Amino acid sequence: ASVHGTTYELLRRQGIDTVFGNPGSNELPFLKDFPEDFRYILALQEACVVGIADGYAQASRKPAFINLHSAAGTGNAMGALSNAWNSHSPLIVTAGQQTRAMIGVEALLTNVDAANLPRPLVKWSYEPASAAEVPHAMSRAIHMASMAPQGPVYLSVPYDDWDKDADPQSHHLFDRHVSSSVRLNDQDLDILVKALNSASNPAIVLGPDVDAANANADCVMLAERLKAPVWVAPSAPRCPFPTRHPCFRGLMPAGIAAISQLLEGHDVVLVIGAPVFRYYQYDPGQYLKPGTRLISVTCDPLEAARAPMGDAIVADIGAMASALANLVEESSRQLPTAAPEPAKVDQDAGRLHPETVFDTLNDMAPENAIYLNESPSTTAQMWQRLNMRNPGSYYTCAAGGLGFALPAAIGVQLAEPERQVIAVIGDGSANYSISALWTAAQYNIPTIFVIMNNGTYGILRWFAGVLEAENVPGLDVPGIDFRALAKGYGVQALKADNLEQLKGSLQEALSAKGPVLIEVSTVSP
Amino acid sequence: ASVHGTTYELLRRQGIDTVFGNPGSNELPFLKDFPEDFRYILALQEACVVGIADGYAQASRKPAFINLHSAAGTGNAMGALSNAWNSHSPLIVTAGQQTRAMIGVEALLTNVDAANLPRPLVKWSYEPASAAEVPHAMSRAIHMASMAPQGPVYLSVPYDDWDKDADPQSHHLFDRHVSSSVRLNDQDLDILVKALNSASNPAIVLGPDVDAANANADCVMLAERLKAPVWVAPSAPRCPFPTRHPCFRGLMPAGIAAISQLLEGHDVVLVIGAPVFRYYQYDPGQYLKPGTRLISVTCDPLEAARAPMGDAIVADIGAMASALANLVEESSRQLPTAAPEPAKVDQDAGRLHPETVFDTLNDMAPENAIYLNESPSTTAQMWQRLNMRNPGSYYTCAAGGLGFALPAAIGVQLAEPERQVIAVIGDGSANYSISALWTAAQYNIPTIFVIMNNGTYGILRWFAGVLEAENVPGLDVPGIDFRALAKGYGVQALKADNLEQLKGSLQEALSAKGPVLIEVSTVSP
Amino acid sequence: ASVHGTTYELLRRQGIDTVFGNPGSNELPFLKDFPEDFRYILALQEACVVGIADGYAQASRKPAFINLHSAAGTGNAMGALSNAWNSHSPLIVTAGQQTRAMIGVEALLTNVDAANLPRPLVKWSYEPASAAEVPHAMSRAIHMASMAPQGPVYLSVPYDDWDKDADPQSHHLFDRHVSSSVRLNDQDLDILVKALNSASNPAIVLGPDVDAANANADCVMLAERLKAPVWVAPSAPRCPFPTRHPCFRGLMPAGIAAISQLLEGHDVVLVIGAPVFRYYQYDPGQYLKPGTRLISVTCDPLEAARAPMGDAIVADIGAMASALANLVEESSRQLPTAAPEPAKVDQDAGRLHPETVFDTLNDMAPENAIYLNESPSTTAQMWQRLNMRNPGSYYTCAAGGLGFALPAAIGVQLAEPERQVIAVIGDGSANYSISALWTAAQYNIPTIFVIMNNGTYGILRWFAGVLEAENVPGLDVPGIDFRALAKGYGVQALKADNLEQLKGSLQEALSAKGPVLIEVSTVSP
Ligand SMILES: Cc1ncc(Cn2c(C)c(CCOP(=O)(O)OP(=O)(O)O)sc2=O)c(N)n1
Ligand SMILES: Cc1ncc(Cn2c(C)c(CCOP(=O)(O)OP(=O)(O)O)sc2=O)c(N)n1
Ligand SMILES: Cc1ncc(Cn2c(C)c(CCOP(=O)(O)OP(=O)(O)O)sc2=O)c(N)n1
Ligand SMILES: [Ca+2]
Ligand SMILES: [Ca+2]
Ligand SMILES: [Ca+2]
Ligand SMILES: [Ca+2]
Ligand SMILES: [Ca+2]
Ligand SMILES: [Ca+2]
Ligand SMILES: [Cl-]
Ligand SMILES: [Cl-]
Ligand SMILES: [Cl-]
Ligand code: NA
Ligand code: NA
Ligand code: NA
Ligand code: NA
């Protein structure tokens, strides 16, 4: 067998059947004779390729496979890799290298010092020392991406390797099963359970790894048993809990003092599947107030090490959430009462308040919709106004890197063909990966893109006003016609300049058989 | 003085007056109180920011300053940095970091292990250990970018550093002059000159560092004195010689055997300002035939070390070209005869042959036009058909990374406001940095963009046919309306479906007062 | 509180009370006011410092703390770090950096790009961005070293940080508990147990992480229940099983074909706490024969990913070994019969055969002795001839790096003051870290060093004979007087030129109240 044949057999035996790519010449020998049982999803720029694969991996809860072109292709994807690192997305990034005979002379398209290029944003990065090692290196990439804590990996392959003979002993790679589905030993788990049972006023904080593990329902049972309020850890990349459940208390503010104040009076705070914590703004104060102790369950040693407070347990979130939910006592305390519904903001017949947009989406979207967010000045509103009952219903860029939601919404919609995906994206953010629209058109992936057009990088204007920073350049983005951009890439386009038009456009989009972009004129901040 | 004030004084004293950027929150304290004497050029995605700055630096022959947002902003620019590395572009890339107080906890937008992120594509990469060190670190970045061999550098700055007090001894940085304008010692230069004077059939090969040094005219004098044919080294990022001078012989094929065959019978081959060599295709054979010896003058130790043949001298290209041109004897051999003009390809009233497009550009463009190329299947034709008399008249992506020419053409046009820039970009390539169009619209930088629309990644289809590679996916890019994309970003748009319309559209574009995109329907390969 | 006071409080609260070091000027501000409750163990060269700390950590089963001087001190320790990486040794390596005010100018003793220096041999490497971050960074170092898979970490600290004010919120670091004591979820553990219970001819292979976890006794119970033979995985850094237990089958040969042949006919092979596998010699063949399947339990994702065959489970070795030993059925198969005692090699009244030396050590040493090995040509003999009943009874360099056993034997003896440590070290190996002897003298740590003097790098001579490699230089090491070297560093020295003198010297050494070196004249290979 050839290295090409052996590698595609390994991929299919490990459950991979789709290649997200933007091709180049070092990849032609890999892509030739492309197997009939695989699909290839083309995107026009590499941030788009990796963003689509990332949404696909996060929603499917399995690894996604990417093929990029040498150093420049890899480099164009590195902002996307920053997000994938922070979301623990299991991405297998492959890039083609020059033929081994011309690496030394640094021929055009040689990826120099290749394994160092994506660092520090990957768990593992490697170029094999011979062609026959390629299947084994690919096996290592598959398992490194997939083991907890999941994350992106990188493999560089010289283009001449694919046609070489494989090692016949590579067959032992095909069916390897590798598990990290582990939980705390019985004695120490009993100690933890006793501490939870004994708490007088416990609180629960959940992060994205809960949704990645599909541990949401177990966390619902855990919060019901403990009769405990549930927050979402700050800078949330996913939604880990039904947002209208009586225990839900919303997204935590991303500040040290704000969080310790919120948790004041809670004697035990159990954090599951989050860093402790992904603060953002500078809000100095106490990490916890007196009387509060924190216990973190995380799948990631790097999270456990860097927490500035609390105890930690490094284990699988699915296994731990299931065990805790089934072991704790039913508390006799009263179940928390549900948060009140948000107020209706006054809306005239002009430009839309973000609050109006979210209320209208919530009124009109299916109960199993999936939302993406890259409208950063409106995040708090979005979290208050969308009822998200089910797992896998929210994604936003985990490292703050713009250009995620537009392509990721296409990959999520590919992963969940029966759940309507609705991406809510600011006018500034929409440009970073605008070419991803073409992929939705070409493959008829029926994502709805809602562009919040206020003409500015609104959150930066806000922060600048806060800092009392005068004379900051570069904060306005006038003069972009998003309906023309959508036309450019083959996506049906609608405009909503007021509420009547928003409702009409959403009705049209929801009925449509293909992707739709709605440009919404929103109020300037 | 503050670190902010001291750093902008250092920049202005070192000749920097423009910031190419896409802003974020870690950069607001740098950008606040932006000095009245500086300009800020916004682009909507970081590959575009760096591509614009790169064209500006290459055409201006001085360093360009870039400000990006943390890890994701830096990562989105890394494909652009791959090209800048191979073109020796003097780019000072700065990125904002989180406040020092929250780096440890890895708050959102912390750039982790920051200096390793852009490696291996930068000459120097650093994050200072204290706020007062920031001006000195910026000084190091300026000189590292600017010293031969020029190249990109990276500096990460925590956002809280800018408001801190500067060291008063930082004033010694402001007026430092650092020179690398050096040439081979007299004794060994005399040996070199004697070898050139004695050669019976010398040849000259020129690379991009000749154009970067503005050594073109000296190389003309050198070739006239030696009566020697002149080629351009393969995979040429710039044009180093007038393309209708009698000595000019065109772009070398990027193959080992092809080059040794071309040079056969030339006893001494003098290479100036190029790697030896930037081969691309696999074309195995002899590096040089018997009877040919090679001597390379390069500004880059890494080029001298990796050449597989020949002697080398590491020195400044401007200083060496000037000295050689003024020291060699006038040979009594006959001056080489000019290459014949290219043939006119038969053209019907339908889709345009690339040859027709280039002949028409050459007929209609000013004699001081500047061209950019990211239409890779038509490069050989372009080089044969455009008379480029002057320095600084051609740019193409030096590492093969697409998404360079569109933004770089805007930076070149900003650098050379009296020279009409015309970028010839394939339909595939145009998408990578499509959002850069907005910058040309907003600042009214009157670049002309000629999109060669053949519906496919034509060069890859060609290579696949060569490899006899069947069933390669992802090679076609149907369904893109480039006039709509241009409308989307505010750029006037024209279409040319035949020669009559091409001529008309070019006449309109050349007269226009702003940027113009022409979508040309070209023949499918 | 100062950063100095806060950091020593964090260390003591996390159980650290000893600093292994070789001091320099960047470390004086850390070492000043050294706390009365801490000890400092000086060694004269940094490979010795880290080797002593490594033996101490491995035997104590807890992290050891090291303080080295800047880049040169760190660099001198990097071979020692290679071994620590492969043995999963929890080492906290700190190095002093220049004052922040002179880092920029690269004053003498600046550690440039410090965090990159020990890569790739550390789990985590870091330099803090401010003085107040130092305690948090130290907390991260402690937990990164200590979490499974354990390993070395590196922290660089500018010398001016220690006297600065600490953050009062650093107190939340002091009592953090972080656990990785996890095991496979119940459902999948039941599947594993059923597979073991059902096997017709199971085999067990144990590696060093079993001994690190003190899982030895549980593995004895597991092998007794399954009635299964037990091997030690190749290139063994520790002994994980009593070597005269009836199930014990010895050290596996470090070859692909040799191992698959050994395992032929075993239907299920359970590997615990080892890489799969640490092969050494090139011995190509099948990874496993038909009919054999392999299941690996490892604490290290990097081991699970790179195994070329078998399934894997990433979990804590102590927790998994305990659970398996207590869950499996008692098999009705007959218990394996003990290996026969090794033969007595003929010995004349001249130079000693290695076999004689090991038999005499086994006759004379206490039953709770601890052995170290850096006599590589005699390893197989050593493993056959020493009855090691207890855990923690054997150490050898896990990455093959010489200079480990001499200093490590001093740290093991410091960790286990009531167990006589006996290091058996070749004449070649003894030189690498010869200065470590001084530490044993100064602190009166009563390690016994047995130098096997055959005048040559015997294993290399052997391999060269195998390769039929003629004319290899540098394989002989004549002319070293080890009794004089021991005198040089204050250690009592004895010589044994024959068996009578070996017995006498061992009797004297075993009674001695301090360290003793015995130079043994062994037969030339
Ligand atoms: C790749 C990248 N570049 C720049 C930024 C900085 N950035 C930028 C430019 C923002 C503006 C978002 O503008 P928008 O129009 O999408 O939304 P709002 O108007 O709601 O702020 S928010 C932010 O952090 C970033 N996060 N990521
Ligand atoms: C950043 C990046 N991604 C992918 C490629 C691979 N690539 C690709 C996709 C090419 C197709 C260019 O298509 P085009 O339409 O611009 O021009 P032609 O039709 O003349 O080939 S040429 C080439 O090397 C690349 N060079 N750089
Ligand atoms: C730090 C280092 N340098 C060199 C070697 C190479 N090496 C060397 C030099 C060996 C010779 C050991 O000689 P010895 O006298 O200690 O023992 P033998 O005579 O039993 O081989 S075994 C081996 O792999 C090494 N393993 N580690
Ligand atoms: Ca409603
Ligand atoms: Ca906006
Ligand atoms: Ca003409
Ligand atoms: Ca094309
Ligand atoms: Ca005996
Ligand atoms: Ca020896
Ligand atoms: Cl257990
Ligand atoms: Cl001179
Ligand atoms: Cl379980
Ligand atoms: Na009202
Ligand atoms: Na990198
Ligand atoms: Na014709
Ligand atoms: Na005998």
Tab-separated table of N, CA and C in Angstrom, chain C residues 11-57:
chain	number	residue	atom	x	y	z
C	11	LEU	N	5.837	28.039	49.053
C	11	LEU	CA	6.587	26.799	48.971
C	11	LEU	C	6.335	25.909	50.207
C	12	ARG	N	6.477	26.489	51.406
C	12	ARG	CA	6.281	25.670	52.599
C	12	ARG	C	4.861	25.142	52.729
C	13	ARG	N	3.876	25.938	52.312
C	13	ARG	CA	2.479	25.509	52.368
C	13	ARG	C	2.161	24.409	51.365
C	14	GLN	N	2.978	24.321	50.308
C	14	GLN	CA	2.846	23.280	49.319
C	14	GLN	C	3.812	22.110	49.557
C	15	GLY	N	4.430	22.088	50.735
C	15	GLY	CA	5.219	20.934	51.169
C	15	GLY	C	6.692	20.972	50.782
C	16	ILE	N	7.187	22.075	50.257
C	16	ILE	CA	8.567	22.130	49.816
C	16	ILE	C	9.391	22.712	50.927
C	17	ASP	N	10.488	22.042	51.273
C	17	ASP	CA	11.305	22.513	52.385
C	17	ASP	C	12.785	22.412	52.092
C	18	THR	N	13.146	22.042	50.852
C	18	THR	CA	14.552	21.844	50.537
C	18	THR	C	14.818	22.521	49.184
C	19	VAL	N	15.945	23.204	49.071
C	19	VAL	CA	16.386	23.827	47.816
C	19	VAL	C	17.686	23.145	47.392
C	20	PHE	N	17.699	22.506	46.227
C	20	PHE	CA	18.934	21.959	45.635
C	20	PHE	C	19.500	23.021	44.733
C	21	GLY	N	20.733	23.440	44.915
C	21	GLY	CA	21.185	24.606	44.163
C	21	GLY	C	22.672	24.673	43.918
C	22	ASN	N	23.012	25.515	42.948
C	22	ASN	CA	24.378	26.023	42.781
C	22	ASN	C	24.108	27.522	42.548
C	23	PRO	N	24.580	28.365	43.453
C	23	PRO	CA	24.157	29.776	43.475
C	23	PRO	C	24.926	30.664	42.526
C	24	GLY	N	24.335	31.810	42.194
C	24	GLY	CA	25.017	32.850	41.424
C	24	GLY	C	24.474	34.183	41.852
C	25	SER	N	24.925	35.247	41.174
C	25	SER	CA	24.558	36.573	41.653
C	25	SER	C	23.104	36.919	41.417
C	26	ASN	N	22.473	36.391	40.358
C	26	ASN	CA	21.060	36.709	40.121
C	26	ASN	C	20.162	36.007	41.145
C	27	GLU	N	20.716	35.051	41.890
C	27	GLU	CA	19.951	34.313	42.880
C	27	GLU	C	20.177	34.806	44.309
C	28	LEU	N	21.154	35.676	44.513
C	28	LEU	CA	21.418	36.132	45.899
C	28	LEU	C	20.200	36.797	46.534
C	29	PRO	N	19.395	37.569	45.778
C	29	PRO	CA	18.256	38.172	46.460
C	29	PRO	C	17.159	37.174	46.816
C	30	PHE	N	17.129	36.013	46.148
C	30	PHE	CA	16.214	34.935	46.516
C	30	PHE	C	16.724	34.174	47.746
C	31	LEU	N	18.029	33.913	47.767
C	31	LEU	CA	18.639	33.105	48.816
C	31	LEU	C	18.932	33.857	50.082
C	32	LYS	N	18.975	35.192	50.039
C	32	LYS	CA	19.177	35.940	51.266
C	32	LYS	C	18.034	35.695	52.236
C	33	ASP	N	18.333	35.845	53.525
C	33	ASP	CA	17.281	35.656	54.535
C	33	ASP	C	16.655	34.273	54.347
C	34	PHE	N	17.504	33.306	54.005
C	34	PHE	CA	16.993	31.955	53.733
C	34	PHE	C	16.254	31.431	54.968
C	35	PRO	N	15.065	30.890	54.798
C	35	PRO	CA	14.257	30.566	55.990
C	35	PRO	C	14.869	29.454	56.808
C	36	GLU	N	14.738	29.602	58.126
C	36	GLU	CA	15.311	28.655	59.092
C	36	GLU	C	14.792	27.216	58.948
C	37	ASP	N	13.552	27.098	58.468
C	37	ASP	CA	12.878	25.810	58.270
C	37	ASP	C	13.186	25.138	56.944
C	38	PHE	N	13.937	25.818	56.088
C	38	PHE	CA	14.355	25.209	54.825
C	38	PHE	C	15.780	24.721	54.922
C	39	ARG	N	16.101	23.740	54.098
C	39	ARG	CA	17.505	23.421	53.905
C	39	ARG	C	17.966	23.716	52.504
C	40	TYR	N	19.266	23.925	52.382
C	40	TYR	CA	19.888	24.135	51.084
C	40	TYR	C	20.919	23.059	50.883
C	41	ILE	N	20.846	22.363	49.753
C	41	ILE	CA	21.832	21.321	49.425
C	41	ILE	C	22.629	21.816	48.247
C	42	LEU	N	23.899	22.163	48.468
C	42	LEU	CA	24.797	22.636	47.428
C	42	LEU	C	25.418	21.475	46.672
C	43	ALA	N	25.462	21.602	45.350
C	43	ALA	CA	26.325	20.777	44.522
C	43	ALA	C	27.170	21.669	43.632
C	44	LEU	N	28.290	21.120	43.175
C	44	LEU	CA	29.343	21.919	42.543
C	44	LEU	C	29.177	22.153	41.040
C	45	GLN	N	28.245	21.452	40.410
C	45	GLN	CA	27.944	21.669	38.994
C	45	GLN	C	26.462	21.337	38.826
C	46	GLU	N	25.828	21.974	37.844
C	46	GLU	CA	24.371	21.931	37.746
C	46	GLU	C	23.798	20.599	37.293
C	47	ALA	N	24.562	19.786	36.550
C	47	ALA	CA	24.056	18.438	36.256
C	47	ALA	C	23.955	17.672	37.565
C	48	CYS	N	24.877	17.962	38.482
C	48	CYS	CA	24.840	17.305	39.789
C	48	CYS	C	23.688	17.804	40.644
C	49	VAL	N	23.457	19.128	40.643
C	49	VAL	CA	22.326	19.674	41.383
C	49	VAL	C	21.004	19.018	40.950
C	50	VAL	N	20.771	19.007	39.626
C	50	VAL	CA	19.514	18.461	39.121
C	50	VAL	C	19.464	16.930	39.305
C	51	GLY	N	20.577	16.203	39.110
C	51	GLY	CA	20.558	14.768	39.383
C	51	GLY	C	20.248	14.399	40.822
C	52	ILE	N	20.825	15.134	41.764
C	52	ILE	CA	20.477	14.923	43.184
C	52	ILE	C	18.989	15.199	43.459
C	53	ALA	N	18.500	16.350	42.981
C	53	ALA	CA	17.095	16.654	43.172
C	53	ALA	C	16.176	15.612	42.526
C	54	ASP	N	16.584	15.100	41.368
C	54	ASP	CA	15.809	14.104	40.627
C	54	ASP	C	15.714	12.804	41.440
C	55	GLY	N	16.854	12.278	41.910
C	55	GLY	CA	16.774	11.105	42.792
C	55	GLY	C	15.916	11.345	44.013
C	56	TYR	N	16.069	12.510	44.615
C	56	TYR	CA	15.235	12.856	45.762
C	56	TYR	C	13.728	12.858	45.429
C	57	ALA	N	13.364	13.498	44.316
C	57	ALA	CA	11.963	13.524	43.909
C	57	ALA	C	11.413	12.144	43.580
